[PDB]
Symmetry: C3
Subunit: 173 residues, 3 copies
């Protein structure tokens, strides 16, 4: 996660470290140090599973103190902790109760995943998947307090690439 | 069975109503038992359990209890999605499932998590609150889970209440004390 | 894997180390030693999952430099890296763009898995399961240029035991 380059040919050709695999259970665990065990923290959202793989681009800083943030679309889930060579489709833009959030949207390299090769951009994503992606985030916080999420929409590849370019630059200081 | 008389984690922050449960088996797990082989340094496939029915619920134990010898208090955690094995969940009692083994009475505690870990189970106050469907799947699991094995049998006796649950917990923690 | 004996009573009674659990995702990973992580290699075949367990018999050597290959039928998948006590049902014979390949077909020992006990030969194996297994292999390299697979048919317990027997001997040489 630390020694993983951002990409072989940036910003078109980037690496993503998987965090949460598609279809993952909506449950947050939390290592107790003082204990050496995983503790069940809480149950996330209204009970909907993660609809895509979620991860990050290593060696990036997105002005969120966080790394650049990626939703990776694949026909089968990817292992948490794995690294996938990827390419951008675009981005999901959201507003929060505490600001703005863009998630990058990606598919793997065509040689890795030949089945996603027909997905040239975000407009190529079936409407059902896109609708499951946005709905996930709209229900994610659900319930909690004075928390919420509004999906503002989708941006394109060029915006994706800018997020990536800037992320790689920030991270260098 | 369970009440024969010949860790780091605490039993609860407010016994007996408020306890901790270490998950051993997640819900919906394959009915297959593996055993670590010390020599080989590998998991060996031990047996296919029962008749092929998956675990209808999460199974774990309350730490720093003894219900019988080398038998901690036994717990069936109800949660809308499975819990990682070796994970710890703060729970509360709903009641009990009462069973007879070829080795005596086996009483499983039933539980949901804490209302702030799992808001979805909040509406479940006792075993009567538990949908009929889940209740039937849980006792059915247990009816069938020794099915394969010579000289082994189970006899599900029925459900007990939150009071009986709470008493098992106390005995449990007390017996671990002795 | 190398600590592991071939069997407790060869050839009828043998051990299989599981590599690929049944129902596994058709996704191939690869450990990158410089990185200390798993890298997503490739999405395999046309997207059909592995229809059976796959492993090998330790302390063997088939005719081709590899250990004896095994297809292990079980009601439920088996953990990769685990060892199961098994018996033989027969063989699946294929032709390849580069030659032949025979796979051993096994179920676990009756006491390990009572529900496979009625399967005494390959003829007892449901046709659906059989068709599933063969189709998997036929569609597997499918989508690779100059790569193909042609299932020729099945052989019986005697050929299975022979492959085991010869395999054990080869390893000793």
């Amino acid at each position: 996660f630390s020694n993983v380059p951002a990409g072989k040919d940036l910003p078109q050709d980037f690496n993503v470290i998987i965090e949460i695999p598609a279809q993952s259970e909506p449950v947050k665990y939390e290592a107790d140090k003082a204990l050496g065990l995983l503790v069940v923290d809480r149950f996330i959202g209204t009970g909907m599973r993660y609809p895509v793989n979620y991860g990050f681009i290593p060696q990036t800083l997105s002005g969120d103190g966080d790394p650049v943030d990626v939703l990776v679309i694949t026909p089968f889930p990817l292992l948490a902790g794995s690294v996938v060579r990827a390419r951008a489709l675009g981005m999901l833009k959201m507003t929060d109760e505490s600001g703005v959030d863009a998630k990058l949207v990606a598919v793997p390299h065509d040689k890795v995943c030949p089945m996603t090769a027909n997905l040239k951009s975000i407009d190529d994503v079936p409407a059902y998947l896109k609708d499951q992606i946005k709905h996930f985030f709209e229900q994610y916080k659900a319930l909690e307090k004075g928390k919420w999420v509004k999906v503002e929409g989708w941006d394109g590849i060029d915006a994706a690439h800018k997020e990536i370019t800037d992320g790689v630059a920030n991270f260098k200081k």
